[PDB]
Amino acid sequence: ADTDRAYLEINLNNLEHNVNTLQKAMSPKCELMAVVKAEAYGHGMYEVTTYLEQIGVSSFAVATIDEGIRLRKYGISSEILILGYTSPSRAKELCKYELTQTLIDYRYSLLLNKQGYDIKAHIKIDTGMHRLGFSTEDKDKILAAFSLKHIKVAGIFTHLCAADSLEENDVAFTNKQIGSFYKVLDWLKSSGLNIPKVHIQSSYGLLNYPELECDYIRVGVALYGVLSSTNDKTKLELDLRPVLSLKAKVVLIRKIKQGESVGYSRAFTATRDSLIAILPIGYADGFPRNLSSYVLIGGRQAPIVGKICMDQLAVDVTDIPNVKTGSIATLIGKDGKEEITAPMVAESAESITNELLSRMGHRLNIIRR
Amino acid sequence: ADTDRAYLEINLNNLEHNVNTLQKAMSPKCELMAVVKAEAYGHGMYEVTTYLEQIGVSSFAVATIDEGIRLRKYGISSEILILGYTSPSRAKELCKYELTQTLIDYRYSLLLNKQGYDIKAHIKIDTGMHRLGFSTEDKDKILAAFSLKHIKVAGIFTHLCAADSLEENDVAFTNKQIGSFYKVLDWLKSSGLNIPKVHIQSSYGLLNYPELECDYIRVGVALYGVLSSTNDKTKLELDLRPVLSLKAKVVLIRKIKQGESVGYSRAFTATRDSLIAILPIGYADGFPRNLSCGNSYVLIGGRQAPIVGKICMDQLAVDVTDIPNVKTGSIATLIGKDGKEEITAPMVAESAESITNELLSRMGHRLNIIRR
Ligand SMILES: [Cl-]
Ligand SMILES: [Cl-]
Ligand SMILES: [Cl-]
Ligand SMILES: [Cl-]
């Protein structure tokens, strides 16, 4: 029904496994804050978060207030951190929906407080990224943010720039961020302040800097069982299992003669008489065009032929037995002994895993496995 | 509220201008078939299609039955053609929602007929694209499709591979596609068949093969006032105006000391003391990550602000060192006009090493859509 054309399959057993692996890898006092922004990295925000809350995960991060509001509507009662700027004009909603707001700088905190609504917040410290956050130099402003009447600071955090790299430049830069971050905490304590919940790590924060002990780890990619690049060399090597697979049903099969093409592409000319299968998936569904690469059918590799179109693409099934309309093609996922992983696809599309997954088309039905 | 973060702005006046400009280039009896698949090429299917019907467009094409059903729920009452496969198991919905189905091949046609539901259809003929459609060889299967009890064939059509190209080889292939198509029609006629409505052209079919005489033209990119690339000299040169703008409001301004980076990516090291504006739009919103590191700029206060560092999932950074009129809340134009400056969808698509169709159809679902 949802499985007639193209669809995403999410393996909740794999997600559940990942949650447990991640939790086990963390310090006992550290909690999993599941990053579910942009439709849970394309995995489906309702599907993922309701299930996560159901198996014990009790902390979430989203990009925007509307994301966070969606979660509340879904029934999510765990705490939720909005990672981005929310306009102060929506302070009543931060209050009503009990959404935890990131304080991006002192001015913003001031304007947010001025709105007059009691709001839970985490303060972001810019430790080198130079996007959002209070600077490590402006310690009086950071401290001042703790004495705002309507702003209940429940946490303090930063974001690492190059935790996914073991290059000495990136290591020194990562340590510099970690170091200046804890110097902020030292300074605050020196001024009598009690430190709230601390978080520093994303996925590669855990993977390459497991010696860190914070109150949460913000897990995105690792939670979904994928790596950012194919075969990375992390300190930890966790048994993470891919949650997402992408499938499409063959809708038509045709013969083309030797010397013919598909879509009249300069790139493809049949070297023999060939059998072509049509799959109802294209770039509008988030399968990248510049892969104009194979799919798996019957555990076999069927090369994509011709350019990828908006709503469909073609594959060569000449060498593959028992292919008919209704046969399931695997664009991302396992098929018997063969596997096409998300990072593999991202890589050949000259992209990273995060972009490929988070840009899965809204048109794709999502179903449980 | 819908303008607080990042949003698309749809110029309905420009869209209406396009509809008129396009109809003018058409034969009087030829009807505009507005192609509104993939959220109307990212423009917002609800916004665009209701307005199109309001201004008198009476024919729509979608990619899937679920798009077609959505149109019906939006109050669309005009005919709708589903261009791609629809599971025969949903023949009841095709019937109930009065959707017209593309016959993608003979076997499909038979199977849909056997469902027992009265369904309107257009038969597709493969004339060289070699994706969907009945082959030109199998003349008898085509004629047989005109004798199915529950399928009423109301049209017959094909797609041109390269109508957008005026190169020798390409023009030749297009002409043989057209020739093959009418050969089928002649053969059908000879078999005592009265031909239904015909359509062969998409946007470039109209622009580059205007001499064709059909009952519909399926207009996609032209309707949205963008041409898939820049800048082909088409046979007709129509006055088409861009419908879509992409906008985002600055959420922070940061001083960057000379020597410092943004996001530590060696992609950017300031050569001077700089001002950086942070925009709450990223690649998850459909703004392609390969636009990173100066591969595009945005418009702020009518001036160009180059993108600095890598584009993130939900945010990016631009250089406003030379634009004093930038504050929290300032509108950045990523696609569209500002002051006397313009950054068009085709320019952005070229920068992204892509094409307009892909850039636009892949606009993120998270973006708010506002009519203008
Ligand atoms: Cl940030
Ligand atoms: Cl990290
Ligand atoms: Cl086709
Ligand atoms: Cl065309």
Short mmCIF file of N, CA, C and O in Angstrom, two decimals, chain B residues 224-277:
data_model
loop_
_atom_site.label_atom_id
_atom_site.label_comp_id
_atom_site.label_asym_id
_atom_site.label_seq_id
_atom_site.Cartn_x
_atom_site.Cartn_y
_atom_site.Cartn_z
N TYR B 224 7.10 27.98 -14.50
CA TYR B 224 7.69 28.56 -13.28
C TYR B 224 8.70 29.66 -13.59
O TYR B 224 9.32 30.23 -12.69
N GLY B 225 8.86 29.96 -14.87
CA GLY B 225 9.61 31.13 -15.29
C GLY B 225 11.11 30.94 -15.19
O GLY B 225 11.88 31.89 -15.10
N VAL B 226 11.52 29.68 -15.20
CA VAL B 226 12.93 29.35 -15.16
C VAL B 226 13.22 28.43 -16.33
O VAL B 226 12.38 27.60 -16.70
N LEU B 227 14.38 28.57 -16.95
CA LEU B 227 14.78 27.58 -17.95
C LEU B 227 15.90 26.69 -17.42
O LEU B 227 16.90 27.18 -16.90
N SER B 228 15.71 25.38 -17.58
CA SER B 228 16.57 24.32 -17.01
C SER B 228 18.07 24.64 -16.93
O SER B 228 18.77 24.15 -16.04
N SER B 229 18.54 25.46 -17.87
CA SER B 229 19.90 25.97 -17.86
C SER B 229 19.94 27.39 -18.40
O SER B 229 18.90 28.02 -18.63
N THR B 230 21.16 27.90 -18.60
CA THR B 230 21.38 29.24 -19.13
C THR B 230 22.64 29.23 -20.00
O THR B 230 23.66 28.69 -19.59
N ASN B 231 22.56 29.80 -21.20
CA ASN B 231 21.35 30.36 -21.77
C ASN B 231 21.15 29.86 -23.20
O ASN B 231 21.79 30.36 -24.13
N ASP B 232 20.27 28.87 -23.38
CA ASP B 232 19.97 28.38 -24.73
C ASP B 232 19.14 29.40 -25.50
O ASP B 232 18.23 30.03 -24.95
N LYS B 233 19.47 29.56 -26.78
CA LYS B 233 18.61 30.31 -27.69
C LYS B 233 17.53 29.38 -28.25
O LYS B 233 17.77 28.65 -29.21
N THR B 234 16.35 29.41 -27.63
CA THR B 234 15.22 28.64 -28.13
C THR B 234 14.64 29.29 -29.37
O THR B 234 14.91 30.46 -29.64
N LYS B 235 13.85 28.55 -30.14
CA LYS B 235 13.25 29.09 -31.35
C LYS B 235 12.31 30.23 -31.00
O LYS B 235 12.43 31.32 -31.54
N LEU B 236 11.37 29.98 -30.10
CA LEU B 236 10.57 31.07 -29.57
C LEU B 236 11.33 31.65 -28.39
O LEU B 236 11.94 30.91 -27.62
N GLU B 237 11.30 32.96 -28.24
CA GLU B 237 11.83 33.56 -27.03
C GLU B 237 10.68 34.24 -26.31
O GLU B 237 10.28 35.35 -26.67
N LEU B 238 10.13 33.56 -25.32
CA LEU B 238 9.00 34.08 -24.57
C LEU B 238 9.46 34.91 -23.39
O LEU B 238 10.57 34.74 -22.87
N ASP B 239 8.58 35.80 -22.95
CA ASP B 239 8.84 36.64 -21.80
C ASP B 239 8.32 35.93 -20.56
O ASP B 239 7.18 36.13 -20.16
N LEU B 240 9.15 35.08 -19.98
CA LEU B 240 8.77 34.31 -18.79
C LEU B 240 9.41 34.91 -17.54
O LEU B 240 10.57 35.33 -17.56
N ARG B 241 8.66 34.96 -16.45
CA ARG B 241 9.16 35.63 -15.25
C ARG B 241 9.24 34.66 -14.07
O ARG B 241 8.32 33.87 -13.86
N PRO B 242 10.34 34.73 -13.28
CA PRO B 242 10.56 33.77 -12.18
C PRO B 242 9.48 33.87 -11.11
O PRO B 242 9.13 34.98 -10.67
N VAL B 243 8.96 32.72 -10.70
CA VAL B 243 7.88 32.66 -9.72
C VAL B 243 8.40 32.50 -8.28
O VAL B 243 7.83 33.05 -7.33
N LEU B 244 9.49 31.75 -8.13
CA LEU B 244 9.97 31.38 -6.80
C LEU B 244 11.10 32.25 -6.27
O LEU B 244 12.08 32.52 -6.98
N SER B 245 10.99 32.66 -5.01
CA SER B 245 12.13 33.21 -4.29
C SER B 245 12.42 32.38 -3.06
O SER B 245 11.50 31.83 -2.46
N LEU B 246 13.69 32.31 -2.68
CA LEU B 246 14.11 31.64 -1.44
C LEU B 246 14.77 32.63 -0.47
O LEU B 246 15.76 33.30 -0.82
N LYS B 247 14.23 32.71 0.75
CA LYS B 247 14.61 33.77 1.69
C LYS B 247 14.96 33.21 3.06
O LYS B 247 14.49 32.13 3.43
N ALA B 248 15.77 33.95 3.81
CA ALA B 248 16.09 33.56 5.19
C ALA B 248 16.53 34.78 6.00
O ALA B 248 17.21 35.66 5.47
N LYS B 249 16.13 34.82 7.27
CA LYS B 249 16.45 35.95 8.14
C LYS B 249 17.66 35.72 9.04
O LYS B 249 17.75 34.70 9.71
N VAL B 250 18.59 36.69 9.03
CA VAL B 250 19.79 36.64 9.87
C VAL B 250 19.45 36.46 11.35
O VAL B 250 18.58 37.15 11.89
N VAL B 251 20.12 35.52 12.00
CA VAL B 251 19.84 35.24 13.40
C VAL B 251 20.97 35.68 14.30
O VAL B 251 20.82 35.73 15.52
N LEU B 252 22.12 36.00 13.70
CA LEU B 252 23.27 36.46 14.45
C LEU B 252 24.32 37.12 13.56
O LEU B 252 24.50 36.72 12.41
N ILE B 253 25.00 38.12 14.10
CA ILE B 253 26.14 38.73 13.44
C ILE B 253 27.34 38.56 14.35
O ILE B 253 27.23 38.75 15.54
N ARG B 254 28.46 38.16 13.79
CA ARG B 254 29.64 37.87 14.57
C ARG B 254 30.84 38.53 13.95
O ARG B 254 31.01 38.48 12.72
N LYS B 255 31.67 39.15 14.79
CA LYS B 255 32.97 39.65 14.35
C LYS B 255 33.96 38.50 14.23
O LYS B 255 34.10 37.70 15.15
N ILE B 256 34.63 38.41 13.10
CA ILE B 256 35.67 37.41 12.92
C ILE B 256 37.02 38.08 12.77
O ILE B 256 37.24 38.82 11.80
N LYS B 257 37.91 37.83 13.71
CA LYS B 257 39.25 38.37 13.61
C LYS B 257 39.99 37.77 12.42
O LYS B 257 39.78 36.61 12.08
N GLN B 258 40.83 38.59 11.80
CA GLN B 258 41.71 38.13 10.73
C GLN B 258 42.53 36.95 11.22
O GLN B 258 43.17 37.03 12.26
N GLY B 259 42.48 35.85 10.48
CA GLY B 259 43.18 34.64 10.87
C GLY B 259 42.24 33.57 11.38
O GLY B 259 42.58 32.39 11.39
N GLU B 260 41.04 33.97 11.80
CA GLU B 260 40.07 33.02 12.33
C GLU B 260 39.21 32.39 11.23
O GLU B 260 39.02 32.97 10.16
N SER B 261 38.69 31.20 11.50
CA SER B 261 37.82 30.53 10.53
C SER B 261 36.36 30.53 10.97
O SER B 261 36.01 31.11 12.00
N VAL B 262 35.52 29.89 10.17
CA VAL B 262 34.16 29.59 10.56
C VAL B 262 33.94 28.09 10.41
O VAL B 262 34.15 27.53 9.33
N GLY B 263 33.52 27.44 11.50
CA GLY B 263 33.35 26.00 11.51
C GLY B 263 34.67 25.27 11.34
O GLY B 263 34.70 24.13 10.90
N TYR B 264 35.76 25.96 11.69
CA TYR B 264 37.15 25.50 11.51
C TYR B 264 37.54 24.87 10.17
O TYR B 264 38.71 24.56 9.94
N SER B 265 36.58 24.67 9.28
CA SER B 265 36.91 24.16 7.95
C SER B 265 37.97 25.07 7.35
O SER B 265 37.77 26.28 7.21
N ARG B 266 39.10 24.47 6.99
CA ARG B 266 40.17 25.16 6.28
C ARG B 266 39.65 25.80 4.98
O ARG B 266 40.38 26.46 4.25
N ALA B 267 38.36 25.59 4.73
CA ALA B 267 37.62 26.19 3.64
C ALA B 267 37.56 27.71 3.72
O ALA B 267 37.29 28.39 2.71
N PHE B 268 37.76 28.24 4.92
CA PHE B 268 37.68 29.68 5.13
C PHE B 268 38.58 30.18 6.23
O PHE B 268 38.47 29.77 7.38
N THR B 269 39.47 31.10 5.88
CA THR B 269 40.29 31.81 6.85
C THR B 269 40.21 33.27 6.49
O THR B 269 40.60 33.66 5.39
N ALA B 270 39.70 34.09 7.41
CA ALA B 270 39.48 35.50 7.11
C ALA B 270 40.80 36.20 6.84
O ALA B 270 41.77 36.04 7.59
N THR B 271 40.83 36.97 5.76
CA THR B 271 42.03 37.68 5.34
C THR B 271 42.02 39.07 5.95
O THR B 271 42.93 39.88 5.72
N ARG B 272 40.97 39.34 6.71
CA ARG B 272 40.80 40.63 7.37
C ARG B 272 39.81 40.47 8.51
O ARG B 272 39.16 39.42 8.64
N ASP B 273 39.69 41.49 9.35
CA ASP B 273 38.67 41.48 10.39
C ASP B 273 37.31 41.55 9.73
O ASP B 273 37.04 42.45 8.94
N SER B 274 36.45 40.58 10.04
CA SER B 274 35.23 40.41 9.27
C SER B 274 33.96 40.41 10.11
O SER B 274 33.99 40.23 11.33
N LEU B 275 32.85 40.63 9.42
CA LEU B 275 31.53 40.46 10.00
C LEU B 275 30.85 39.28 9.31
O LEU B 275 30.81 39.21 8.08
N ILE B 276 30.31 38.37 10.12
CA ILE B 276 29.63 37.19 9.60
C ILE B 276 28.16 37.18 10.00
O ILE B 276 27.83 37.37 11.17
N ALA B 277 27.27 36.95 9.03
CA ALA B 277 25.87 36.77 9.36
C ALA B 277 25.52 35.30 9.32
O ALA B 277 25.90 34.58 8.40
#
